[model samples]
Target: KLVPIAPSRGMIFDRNGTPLALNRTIYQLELMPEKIENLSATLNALRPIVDLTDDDIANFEKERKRSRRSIAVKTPLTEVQVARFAVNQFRFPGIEVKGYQRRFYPYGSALTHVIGYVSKINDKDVERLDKEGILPNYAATHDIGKLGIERYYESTLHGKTGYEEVEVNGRVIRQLHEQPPQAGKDIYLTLDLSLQIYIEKLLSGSRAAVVVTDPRTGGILALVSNPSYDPNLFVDGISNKDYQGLLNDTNRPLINRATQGVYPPASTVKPYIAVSALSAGVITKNTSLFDPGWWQLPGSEKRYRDWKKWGHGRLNVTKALEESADTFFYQVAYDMGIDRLSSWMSKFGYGEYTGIDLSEERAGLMPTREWKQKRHKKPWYQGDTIPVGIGQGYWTATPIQMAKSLMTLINDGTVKTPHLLQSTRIDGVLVPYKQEDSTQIGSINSGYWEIAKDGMYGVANRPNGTGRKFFEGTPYKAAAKSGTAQVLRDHKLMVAFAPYENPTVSVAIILENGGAGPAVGTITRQILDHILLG
Candidate 1:
C-alpha cells in the first residue's frame, strides 16, 4: 500500500516581513466510505451533532463517484461543531474530524488583488500539471493558486509530494520505504504592508487605482485597486451566491485596476512628450510658444480647446507644465507626428508590459497610424495627433505603466522593470531574486532631461503650478504633473516623485469620473507624505 503525503504550500510576506498569505489549520468532517458499514445510520446521527445540509450529502455523493478514499462533505466545521463531533466520536465509525492546512489571508481585502487566493484544483489545472510532466509532484496536493502573485509564482510555491510504501495484510503493516514531502519556499515581495493597507483605506470610497514604487530599484512599494473584495471568501471555494455578488457588482471589484484599468494618461504625460519633442529637435529647453487658449492646424476650421480659456501667454516648457497649457503640447505633438510620438512613448513602457510579477497585466494602447488603420479602419488625421499631445485620444495607459514611465523619467532615461518579488527563502536561508537587467531609453541631450524634470517641478513648486495649492505645506519638495481626461466626465490623474533632488518614491494615480477638483493632487500629496515621513 502506498500513502501520499501532501506538502505545505509556501507563505508570502511583504518587504517588511509581514505575513500576507499563510496557512491555518481548518477542521472538517470527512467520510471514509470503505470503512462505513452503516452509512445511512451514520448520516442520521451526524445531522444532530453538526449542521449537515442536504447539499453536503449531495456533494459527498458526487465526490464518492470520483474517489473511494476519505472525502470532506462539510468543510471548515465550526468550533462548537468540531467539539460536538469530537465528544461523540465513539458513536460514529466512518466519519471523523480532521484538521488540514488551508491557505489563509490574514489581511483579507487589503491584499486581495495582489496576493490573490488558492482553492481546490480542477480538471483544467490537472491537465496543465500533467502536460508540464509535473503531476506526480502534485499527487497529494488539493489546491493551487488561481491568480495574482499566487498564480504567477505557482511553481515556486507548490512543493514536491512525498510517499510511503508499506506491506499490509489487514493490520500490523511494516513500512518498506518513506519519503517526506518538502515544504514550498517562502517568497518575499517588495510591497510595504503598512503602505498598502493605508492606501486601501484612503481609497475605499473611490473607484481608483494607485501605484507607488521605489524608482531607484523599480521595486513596487504599494499597488492598490479600490473596492476590493475579501479574498478569504475564495480560499474554501466561494458559494454561488457570494460569487455572483462580486461578478454582478457594477464597480467590478474583480479587476486589478492598478495594472488592468486603462485610461487616457491626460496632461500627466506632458513632461514625457516634452522630452520626446526635445530629443527630436521639435523643441528646445529655451523654446517658447504663445498660447491664446486654442490650437488649430493651418487652414483647418476645427479647433482644439485648451483647459484654460485665457491661456498663459508666451509660455516655455516649464510654464506650460505648471499651468497645464494644452495648446503648447498640441503644437509639439503635431510637429513630432504619431509615429515618432508612439515610438518614443513605447520606449517609456507605453503599449508594453511593465514586467511586474503578476500575470493579470495589460499592455495599454499607444496608438499609431497602423494601429488606427487596423482597429478603426480609418486613416490617421492631424486632429488625432493634437489630442495625443495632451495624452488624450487613443493614447491610454495603466497606472502601473504610468508609474513605470514616471520612474523612467525620474531615473533619467534608465528603465527598470517594475517588480514585486524581492527574495525567496527555503529552510530559513534567504536567496535574493535575480532582478531583470535595466534598460535605457535612446540617447537624448542631458539638458532635455533636466528641462523635462524641471517642468514637472514647476507643476508642484512654481507660483502658478497646477498642484501648487495642494502641495503647499509639504515638508519635502515634489515634482509633479496633474491631468484630467474627458470621457463623459473628467477622470483625474497625477504622476509624481518627491524630494526634488534625490527622489525616493514615484506614484501614479487615477480617479475614474472624479470630476474637476484637487482630489487627485490631494491624494498624491497624502501618499507621498506617508511614504517619505513615516
Candidate 2:
C-alpha cells in the first residue's frame, strides 16, 4: 500500500544570522470527506481531546456533508489522540495523524511589512501554475510569498524540488527510492534588528518613518514604519474581525511609509538646492542673500513667509542652511533658473527611485518647466520657482529618497543604490553582491561642499543653529539640517551624518505635525548618538 510523505521548507534568517522566520512540525488529525462516515460523531469524540469551537464543529460538519469529496477538516490532534489514532487506524476510518509544518515569525509585527507574509495558493495561482506545468509539484497546496522581501525573492527562497521514485508490485505494495529536496538559499540583509527595535520604541506614539543607510556602500541599516501590525496573525489565518480592524485602522498599518508615503521636501530640499547652485557655477561659497523673513515675486505682492517671520537678514549659504532661510534658496533658485535647478537637483537623486531593495517605492516629484506643463496643463510661471526652491509646492519626496540623497551628498559625489540583502549563498558558498555603480554629477569648488557642510555643523554645534540643542556635548562631530515642511502648517524634518570628517551613517527623520525643527533634530540626534557611541 502507498503511504503519504510531507517535506519542509528552509528557515529564513536576518542579516545578523538571527532566525526570523521558520517552520515547526506537529501531529494533526486530517479528515477526508470521501472516506469518512458520521463526521459529527467523529468530531464530537475528538472535541474533548482537541479544542474545536461550536461554530468550527458546525462548519466542519456542514462542509463534510455537502463535500465533493476533496475537502478535509484539520483538527490539530493532541498527543493522546495521535497515539490512539495510530493504534486504532481501522476504527478511525478516514482520520490520519500527519506531520505538517507551520510558519512562525519570532519578531512578529516588527517585520510585518519587511518580511511580508505567505498564504495558500488561491485560484489565480493555481491557474498560473497550470499554465506553467508545475501544478503537480504544488498540488498538495502550500503558502507562497506575497509581499515585501518574501515576494521580491520568491524563486530564490522557494528552492529546488526533487522527487522519490517508487516501484509497485501487482498488489500495489511498493519499494521506494527517495531523492531529497534542495533547500533555499539563506538571505543575508543589512538590517540591524536591535536598532530597528529601538527606533520603533522611539516612534511608538507617533505615525512616522525613519530611514538609515551607509553613505559609502548604500546599505540600508534600519527602515521603520510605525503603527505596525503583527505578521504572525496572518501566518496561519487571521480572524475576520482582526483583518477588518487592520483595514479599518486610521493609520493605514499595512502601508510602508518609509518607501511609499510621499511628502513635501520642506527645508530638507534646501541643501540639495545649495549643492545645485554650487555645482552650476551660479553661486560661490560666499554667496549671500537678504532675507526680510518674507519673499515675493519681482513685481507681485504674493509674499512667501519664512518660518521665522522676523527674517534672517543678510545671511550667507552656511547661515541660511542652519536657519533654513526660505529667502536664501529662493534667490538661489531664481539665479539658477528652473531648468538648471531641476537638472542639478536630479543629479542628487531626486525625482527618481533610490533603487532600494524593497519593491514598493514611490519616486517623488521633481518639478520642472516641462513637468509643470504636462501635469498641471498650464504654462510654467516664474513664481513657481520660489516654492520649488524651498522644497514646497509640487516638490515631494519619500523618506528613503531623502535619506539616499543625503547619503549621496555625504559620499561627496557618488550615489550608490540602497540594498538590503548583503549577500546570497550559491553552491554551498556565500557570494556577496556588488555595490551599485557610482556617478559624479559635478565637482564643487574645494570650499563649496564644506560651506554647506559647515552650515550643517552649525545647525548642530552652534548656539544660534536650529539643531544645536540636540547635539550639545555629543562625542561625535555631526553635520545636520532641520526642516519644517508645511502640512497645514509644517511637518518637522531632520537629516544628519555622523563623524563629519569621515562620515559613516546618514539618516532622515520625518515627524508628522511636529512644530519645531528642534524636536526632529533631537530625535535624529538620539538616533545618531546610538549608532556612533553605542
Candidate 3:
C-alpha cells in the first residue's frame, strides 16, 4: 500500500509579507492495530509512560472499529512522556513514533474572524471529504480548515498529496526512496498588519466591526470584529470545556461580525438615498421640505420622529443630509416611492453580496415593496418608505458591504468588489489575483456627484451639522456621515472617505448596540488620521 507523504500547508502573509498563518513540526504516538497481539493489552501497558484519558481511549476504540490500519492517539507528546515512552518501548510491540506538520497562527485571536483556523478531521467531515473527492488528501493529514479564511481558501491552501512506498512489519519501518511532497501555494492577503492591529484595539470594549479599504484599488486594509476568540485552540481539536466557553459566551466570539452580522444601515445610507433621488430626478438641489420635529403622510396619523425633539425647520436636499434631517428624506422617499428607492439603492450593492473572496459573508436585506409583500404577507405602506429613505426600516447591510459601498461612491461611481487576496505563490512564482471589471455608476449624472459629496462634506464641516463634534478640523480633508438607528437597542453607524482629492481611504464602522456620543466619529477620525496623516 502507498503511504501518503504529508505536505506542509502553505503559510498566509499580509500584503507586506508578514506571516499570519504558519506551520510547525510536531511528534505523535500511534499504534498499528493490525500488528498488535492484543490491542487492550498494549494500551494498558503504555499507561505508565503516557497520560491517558477516557476520551483518548474512546477515540482509539472508534478508529479501531473503522479501520484495522495504524492511527495516531494523543500527539506532540510531553517531553516527560516522550522520554519515558522511549525507555519502555521494548514492552510495546506495535507502537510507533511519527513526526508530522501542525498548523499555527502567530497573530492568535487578532485575525480569527478573517484567517480562520484548522483543526483535526472529525467524524463530522468524513462524509463531506468522500463526497468532495478529498478523502485521498485526508489519508495522511490530520488537520482541516475549520473556519474563516482557512475554510474559504481550503482548496488553494491544501496542496495535493504524494505517496511514499513504505514497508511495515512488526516494529521495523523504512521508506523506499525519499520523494518529498509538494507544498501548497502560499497566499498573500491585502490586509495591512499594522492597520489591522491598531483597529482591533480601537474596537475594544464594544461589540463592533470596523472595515477600512482603499477606494482607488478596492483592497481591504483592515477588517476587525471585536470580541474575537483565539483560533489556535481549534488547531488541535478544542477541548469540550473550552469550546463550550466560546459557544456559551453571551458576546458570541465565534461569529464573524464583520461579514455575518447584519445591522441597520442607519444614517450612513442617507447619502446613497440622496444619490438615488437625484439620479431619478425625483428631487433636485432646490427641493425643500419642512421639518417640525416629526413627519406624517398627508392623510395618515402615524408620526415619524427625528432625533431632535425640536427640528431644524425647513431643509433643502443638501441641508437635510448635512443635518441628517429625517423629515426631509422622508418626503424624498414619499415622492420617490418604495419601488424606486429599493431598485435604485441596489445599484450600490445593498441586498446583495459584495462578491468578496472570503466565505461566510451574508447578503443583507434591502426591503422592496415586493419583498415586504412576500415576506410579511402584507401590502406596501408609505410609512415603511420613510424609514428606508433615512436607512432604517427593513434596510440592512454587513460591515463589509457598507465599506464597499462607501468606496464605490468615493470612486465617483466606479464600483469595485472589496477584496483581501492579492496573490498566491506557487513553485517560486508569484501569481496576482485578477479582479473583475469595475461596475460603473453610469445612471447618476456626473454633475450630481459633486452634489452628493458636498452634502457629506457639510455633515462634518458645516455649522449645525450632526458630525461636527468629531469630524471637524481633520488635516486629511475627510467627509463623513453618522447614523443613529432607532431600535429597541440603538445601533450607531458611520461611513467616511478621506484625502478628498485622489482619495485613498474609505471606512465603514458599525457599532452594534454601541453606546452614544463620539464613539462612531471618534473612531472614524482616528482611522483616517492614521491612514492619511500618519
Local distance difference test, per candidate?
Answer: 0.86, 0.76, 0.82
**Candidate 2 residue lDDT tens string, 176-285:** 76566566676777778888888887887677888888777788888888778988777677789998999999878988888887888788788778877877778887
Clashes of each: 0, 3, 0
**Where does candidate 3 stray beyond 4 Å?**
29-67, 71-74, 77-96, 168-174, 177-180, 443-445, 516-518
* Rank list by lDDT: 1, 3, 2
Give Cα distance to truth, residue 291, candidate 3, Å.
3.1
Question: Candidate 1 lDDT, tens digit per residue, 1-534?
Answer: 888778899999999899899988889898667667777677777888988888878888888888844788687699999998888877775576767888889889988889998888989999998899998888878889998999999989988788888663322136798898888989999999999988887787788999998987889999999889999888768999999999999889999999999999999899889888888888887799889998878568888888889877899887887889999998888888899999999988899988899999999899989999999999998888888899889988999999999988987798878999998887788887766565888564477778888888888998888889878888899999989888857889999999889999989999888823339888898899998888
The most accurate candidate by TM-score is 1
Model 1 regions lying over 4 Å from their true place: 28-32, 35-69, 72-98, 167-176, 515-518
- Sliding window of 10 residues with minimal summed lDDT for model 1: 166-175
Question: Model 3 — which ten-residue stretch has the worst lDDT?
Answer: 170-179
TM-score of each: 0.91, 0.88, 0.89
Cα lDDT tens digits, model 3, 64-89, are: 77884467766657777877888887
